[PDB]
RNA sequence: UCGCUCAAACAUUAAGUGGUGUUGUGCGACACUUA
RNA sequence: ACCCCCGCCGUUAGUUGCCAGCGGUUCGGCCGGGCACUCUAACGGGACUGCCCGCGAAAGCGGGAGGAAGGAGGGGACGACGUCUGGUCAGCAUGGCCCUUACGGCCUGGGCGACACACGUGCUACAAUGCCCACUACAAAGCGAUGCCACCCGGCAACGGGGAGCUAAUCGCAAAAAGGUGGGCCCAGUUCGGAUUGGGGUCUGCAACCCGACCCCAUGAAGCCGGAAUCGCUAGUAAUCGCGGAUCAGC
């Protein structure tokens, strides 16, 4: 159940305690940052590409 | 009297647009306090590299959100038209209030 | 007239406003022997004054902020040095060899990832 | 005791306040 | 003095002496002192005869304590026992009532480690 | 390290008497990085020194650490596949290190309640010629002369 | 804990009200082990599910403040 | 408090075998190997 | 090596800060005023074996001065041709095989939380360099519109209610803790230790039996720094003490 779940994640038919976070890009079930709305994986992928504005390689 | 906020990401583009306003306001009106850099609010995001299990070698980024402040005193009519027309922003979301 | 110098260590800054007089030392209000209580490093910060042979002859006034309690003391130590050396070129020829003019690069380093404390790694195992 | 459910640092470690710990 | 019927916390802090009393601890110890104006520092070895019956009878008749308290504790368990709630069956086999890590430790109720 | 000898850490001289040996003692006392706490704890015993005997804490400290300074010790070493307990002189630094160290431990061995009184009484028996730390010194020197046979491998 | 208005299902009270409305049997296969037992519901038999089947667990005075799940095993050998 | 035999559990091994090492039962005062 | 942080200082800007210099003092940088100085970030210089002594053919090493800092100054980013037929078809994409009124779809309840046992990684202790408690002081970084909560009242309290400010260097989370002065404690399974269990409450959520966190009263367990074995770490490191976020209804 991968496809039927990504659709159900956007449904929110019953109570709000089912509208769990869900990555947008690859539709991951966990590790979904709320700010980006993406999973940790696709997040890094884009960041290397430069498609993430203001997101620079951290070094300190 | 008037106060302008110049939020944005790239400080190179923030410096060009902030310096532009300082020349346009002073060279055509009353006094204007130069660019006042504020504490850059940064979003440091840490995370793991590999897709599966690798609680190490992880990689992390940071969202540089800059801040620059510029105050113009006397409401010059030349400065209002100058900034309304001669402007070249881009990724710099500015917000101005009295 | 006055002797000024900048103090700093572990992000604990300390302005040093010194004025020749008695020995009354105020730092961010309060007295020196008052603010620092039960700390031997206190009398150590006044080391620059004992090196110049003028302990009780100067009213100090320092603005030390940020950092820890002791980091301030080290900020005062270097601050007083820059203060008395400001109006004294010859007192640098005997304050420097005694080691005083240094920001003390010694500072806490970043806690590395994968580790626990920038160096200490979790207990290795194989069982 | 950083584990006492009724002490000064007892709540300081648990990130709470309560009675024994001063609260507004 | 024989305070709680049989218990005799002599020769020590008056407040701590009450802690030894079953059903009485650190909190109920200070409470008896602020309701009878007793100094926690003074010992039981040197107190007034009036303060004896005073503090003693007070806490004694006030709240539940001693074996009769313990009887109620087991009484409730007889109730969790007569039917068999999930809480009771943990007392049956000796398991914890929190459903904690039984796959690992929890030796406090399970007794010593029966390697076997 | 295999390359350099790695130079000693030149510590800060005493901030009350003017002597590196005293500060070094504070460090051994220093639990969880509380120098100012241990410093006082040390000066506390210094005053207990003048209380008992009209003697300066300075020389009472020197005499103590001196009489607990191990002259020789046995070190293990391999030879073809066997361990010999070879005795030989210690380095000046190591003697000072062990001396200061044992003393601290000998204080912990004492039944004395307060730490300062433990270091106080211990500093007396040490400067004297008989104490918990001193007896641990006499003990190590015995091992040296005992195995004096294997002293042929001075290396 | 639900101190403001004791939690429980409507169909529970509804099905059990008609049981008191004329004093019927007690058979009632439920699926809400999350609910609190009703006081006057003594003498009935709620067939509480538990993943496996319906447990004919009776009821009485003492068993009231607790849940329906309290008196229904969810694991084998317990 | 020590000496000893035996049967588990754990530790050394990359792993096994064996052994070695501690605690448990009853009494007397490293080496070898790995289709 | 060029990239960033902390290292010396200045250049640019002044709602961060200054009884410092003066007037009111409610004796609080609260008002006036100012930016030199602290700070907030941005640009640039600086250290290069450059100087002297000694060894040396060269490269280079050792010692001394000036300097904030010497021989990469400390840390990070950065981890080659490849190996481990390493890992991942449950992040995703994907060749082929297999299911297709069910290996697909929906809900409710249960289950990853089971316990006679074993191992790894951790928190907190087995206490008088200390435990319980009253007062006082010094951080960095971060986050905050369906969220952070200053002030007033109820109670033992969690918590609730009234209600001001905030697109956030100037409003909130916030007392940093340890530490400084003072008190009881007196070597005791202890004012150490809070695990376990009884009863009564609060918070979020359709729903805290299974299976949440958090108060309060009580019960006050194992537990005297630990065998064979074994781990971390070379300096602002170890050890030790508090703080923040992500994740997130709450945990
Ligand atoms: Mg996609
Ligand atoms: Mg020096
Ligand atoms: Mg550190
Ligand atoms: Mg730092
Ligand atoms: Mg850092
Ligand atoms: Mg501790
Ligand atoms: Mg918090
Ligand atoms: Mg209140
Ligand atoms: Mg009942
Ligand atoms: Mg044996
Ligand atoms: Mg047997
Ligand atoms: Mg036999
Ligand atoms: Mg014998
Ligand atoms: Mg053999
Ligand atoms: Mg064979
Ligand atoms: Mg300027
Ligand atoms: Mg300036
Ligand atoms: Mg050259
Ligand atoms: Mg040249
Ligand atoms: Mg020459
Ligand atoms: Mg050359
Ligand atoms: Mg040359
Ligand atoms: Mg030098
Ligand atoms: Mg020079
Ligand atoms: Mg070099
Ligand atoms: Mg590289
Ligand atoms: Mg496939
Ligand atoms: Mg396809
Ligand atoms: Mg079929
Ligand atoms: Mg503060
Ligand atoms: Mg920062
Ligand atoms: Mg948060
Ligand atoms: Mg509030
Ligand atoms: Mg605002
Ligand atoms: Mg605050
Ligand atoms: Mg103290
Ligand atoms: Mg106790
Ligand atoms: Mg307790
Ligand atoms: Mg519950
Ligand atoms: Mg030890
Ligand atoms: Mg043994
Ligand atoms: Mg939240
Ligand atoms: Zn994703």
mmCIF file of C-alpha atoms in Angstrom, chain C residues 1-122:
data_model
loop_
_atom_site.group_PDB
_atom_site.id
_atom_site.type_symbol
_atom_site.label_atom_id
_atom_site.label_comp_id
_atom_site.label_asym_id
_atom_site.label_seq_id
_atom_site.Cartn_x
_atom_site.Cartn_y
_atom_site.Cartn_z
ATOM 1 C CA UNK C 1 44.284 61.232 31.063
ATOM 2 C CA UNK C 2 42.494 57.875 31.038
ATOM 3 C CA UNK C 3 43.910 54.459 30.166
ATOM 4 C CA UNK C 4 41.721 52.350 27.871
ATOM 5 C CA UNK C 5 42.112 48.807 26.565
ATOM 6 C CA UNK C 6 39.913 46.087 25.086
ATOM 7 C CA UNK C 7 39.354 42.746 26.807
ATOM 8 C CA UNK C 8 37.902 39.606 25.230
ATOM 9 C CA UNK C 9 37.916 35.820 25.655
ATOM 10 C CA UNK C 10 35.254 33.178 24.959
ATOM 11 C CA UNK C 11 32.999 35.926 23.584
ATOM 12 C CA UNK C 12 33.263 37.666 26.957
ATOM 13 C CA UNK C 13 34.170 41.261 26.101
ATOM 14 C CA UNK C 14 35.418 43.834 28.630
ATOM 15 C CA UNK C 15 36.028 47.554 28.111
ATOM 16 C CA UNK C 16 38.670 48.941 30.467
ATOM 17 C CA UNK C 17 38.289 52.549 31.601
ATOM 18 C CA UNK C 18 41.130 53.324 34.003
ATOM 19 C CA UNK C 19 41.746 56.617 35.814
ATOM 20 C CA UNK C 20 44.757 57.205 38.110
ATOM 21 C CA UNK C 21 43.713 57.687 41.734
ATOM 22 C CA UNK C 22 43.246 55.364 44.713
ATOM 23 C CA UNK C 23 42.338 51.734 44.069
ATOM 24 C CA UNK C 24 38.550 51.731 43.951
ATOM 25 C CA UNK C 25 37.628 49.339 41.139
ATOM 26 C CA UNK C 26 34.112 49.278 39.678
ATOM 27 C CA UNK C 27 33.112 46.812 36.962
ATOM 28 C CA UNK C 28 29.523 46.832 35.711
ATOM 29 C CA UNK C 29 28.716 48.485 39.012
ATOM 30 C CA UNK C 30 29.521 46.778 42.303
ATOM 31 C CA UNK C 31 33.083 46.529 43.595
ATOM 32 C CA UNK C 32 35.823 44.177 42.381
ATOM 33 C CA UNK C 33 36.247 42.324 45.683
ATOM 34 C CA UNK C 34 32.443 42.376 45.843
ATOM 35 C CA UNK C 35 31.530 40.900 42.450
ATOM 36 C CA UNK C 36 34.267 38.267 42.493
ATOM 37 C CA UNK C 37 33.884 36.323 45.736
ATOM 38 C CA UNK C 38 35.716 33.102 46.569
ATOM 39 C CA UNK C 39 37.745 33.062 43.356
ATOM 40 C CA UNK C 40 41.548 33.117 43.281
ATOM 41 C CA UNK C 41 41.601 34.140 39.622
ATOM 42 C CA UNK C 42 40.215 37.468 40.837
ATOM 43 C CA UNK C 43 43.484 38.770 42.295
ATOM 44 C CA UNK C 44 45.137 37.276 39.209
ATOM 45 C CA UNK C 45 43.332 39.663 36.848
ATOM 46 C CA UNK C 46 45.045 42.477 38.740
ATOM 47 C CA UNK C 47 48.371 40.880 37.805
ATOM 48 C CA UNK C 48 49.058 43.623 35.214
ATOM 49 C CA UNK C 49 48.858 46.121 38.084
ATOM 50 C CA UNK C 50 51.326 44.185 40.250
ATOM 51 C CA UNK C 51 53.702 43.991 37.285
ATOM 52 C CA UNK C 52 53.700 47.783 36.927
ATOM 53 C CA UNK C 53 54.159 48.304 40.681
ATOM 54 C CA UNK C 54 50.998 50.398 41.028
ATOM 55 C CA UNK C 55 48.344 48.274 42.747
ATOM 56 C CA UNK C 56 46.776 50.925 44.964
ATOM 57 C CA UNK C 57 47.047 54.003 42.755
ATOM 58 C CA UNK C 58 44.418 53.521 40.044
ATOM 59 C CA UNK C 59 40.619 53.647 39.950
ATOM 60 C CA UNK C 60 39.396 51.085 37.425
ATOM 61 C CA UNK C 61 36.076 50.928 35.592
ATOM 62 C CA UNK C 62 35.390 47.982 33.294
ATOM 63 C CA UNK C 63 32.367 47.003 31.197
ATOM 64 C CA UNK C 64 32.531 43.215 30.867
ATOM 65 C CA UNK C 65 29.620 41.414 29.210
ATOM 66 C CA UNK C 66 28.740 37.983 27.855
ATOM 67 C CA UNK C 67 30.756 34.819 28.369
ATOM 68 C CA UNK C 68 31.200 33.047 31.691
ATOM 69 C CA UNK C 69 32.219 34.286 35.132
ATOM 70 C CA UNK C 70 35.891 33.408 34.660
ATOM 71 C CA UNK C 71 36.042 34.272 30.956
ATOM 72 C CA UNK C 72 35.314 37.799 32.124
ATOM 73 C CA UNK C 73 38.302 37.681 34.473
ATOM 74 C CA UNK C 74 40.619 36.756 31.607
ATOM 75 C CA UNK C 75 38.982 39.539 29.596
ATOM 76 C CA UNK C 76 39.803 41.944 32.420
ATOM 77 C CA UNK C 77 43.357 40.596 32.608
ATOM 78 C CA UNK C 78 44.119 41.468 28.981
ATOM 79 C CA UNK C 79 41.967 44.598 29.131
ATOM 80 C CA UNK C 80 43.934 46.185 31.966
ATOM 81 C CA UNK C 81 47.115 45.338 30.059
ATOM 82 C CA UNK C 82 46.062 47.245 26.949
ATOM 83 C CA UNK C 83 44.969 50.039 29.285
ATOM 84 C CA UNK C 84 48.281 50.595 31.072
ATOM 85 C CA UNK C 85 50.306 49.916 27.908
ATOM 86 C CA UNK C 86 48.265 52.499 26.010
ATOM 87 C CA UNK C 87 49.964 55.326 27.917
ATOM 88 C CA UNK C 88 53.197 53.365 28.419
ATOM 89 C CA UNK C 89 55.458 52.072 25.611
ATOM 90 C CA UNK C 90 58.134 50.964 28.061
ATOM 91 C CA UNK C 91 55.659 48.896 30.079
ATOM 92 C CA UNK C 92 55.143 46.740 26.993
ATOM 93 C CA UNK C 93 58.825 45.795 27.169
ATOM 94 C CA UNK C 94 58.085 44.012 30.454
ATOM 95 C CA UNK C 95 54.416 43.081 30.141
ATOM 96 C CA UNK C 96 54.889 41.176 26.886
ATOM 97 C CA UNK C 97 57.702 38.836 28.023
ATOM 98 C CA UNK C 98 55.540 38.100 31.072
ATOM 99 C CA UNK C 99 52.855 37.044 28.600
ATOM 100 C CA UNK C 100 49.766 39.251 28.624
ATOM 101 C CA UNK C 101 49.071 40.412 25.064
ATOM 102 C CA UNK C 102 47.127 37.481 23.585
ATOM 103 C CA UNK C 103 43.423 36.915 22.945
ATOM 104 C CA UNK C 104 44.132 33.359 24.087
ATOM 105 C CA UNK C 105 43.033 31.463 20.973
ATOM 106 C CA UNK C 106 41.952 28.645 23.296
ATOM 107 C CA UNK C 107 38.210 28.361 22.642
ATOM 108 C CA UNK C 108 35.554 25.638 22.664
ATOM 109 C CA UNK C 109 35.219 23.764 19.373
ATOM 110 C CA UNK C 110 32.164 22.484 17.504
ATOM 111 C CA UNK C 111 30.604 19.194 18.620
ATOM 112 C CA UNK C 112 31.165 16.954 15.575
ATOM 113 C CA UNK C 113 28.400 14.754 14.148
ATOM 114 C CA UNK C 114 28.601 11.008 14.702
ATOM 115 C CA UNK C 115 30.517 11.793 17.894
ATOM 116 C CA UNK C 116 29.220 12.987 21.274
ATOM 117 C CA UNK C 117 31.446 15.908 22.219
ATOM 118 C CA UNK C 118 33.540 16.975 19.229
ATOM 119 C CA UNK C 119 35.898 14.096 20.029
ATOM 120 C CA UNK C 120 34.546 11.588 22.557
ATOM 121 C CA UNK C 121 32.997 8.835 20.417
ATOM 122 C CA UNK C 122 30.289 6.472 21.763
#
